[PDB]
Nucleic acid binder design. Structure first.
Length: 66
DNA sequence: CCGCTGCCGCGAATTCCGTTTCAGGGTACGCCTGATAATTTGCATTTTAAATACCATTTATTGGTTACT
């Protein structure tokens, strides 16, 4: 639904995804295993009902909210 | 009758260096014509914004949940 509905943690993964870092680079940056990144991304996929990260990223950048 | 004159040929050291690359003949003219040497177009091969038609092995996303601050 809405990107602001996410938790601060989920906001962090979301912003890292929108910044173009790949999943393992996200794991490196936050010093966590790939499993937690997979858990976060799969919950984002389920809640946002989306197929890929790119669509969410482009929708985030569309309105130029920042 | 086998002697001498007079012609004509031929020759005269070695390396470097230098320097002005330079001048001097004292005679006509106007036609046709072909004969080259100039200049003008098209067609072969590249190269074509790219567009296109298959093989390829290596990440990406991934299928997410079972344990657990």
């Amino acid at each position: 639904r809405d990107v602001n509905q996410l938790t601060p943690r989920e906001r962090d993964i979301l912003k890292l995804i929108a910044q173009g870092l790949p999943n393992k680079m996200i794991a490196r940056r936050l010093d966590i295993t790939e499993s937690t990144v997979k858990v976060h991304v799969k919950h984002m996929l389920k809640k946002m009902k989306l197929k890929s990260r790119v669509e969410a990223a482009v929708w985030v950048h569309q309105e130029r909210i920042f």
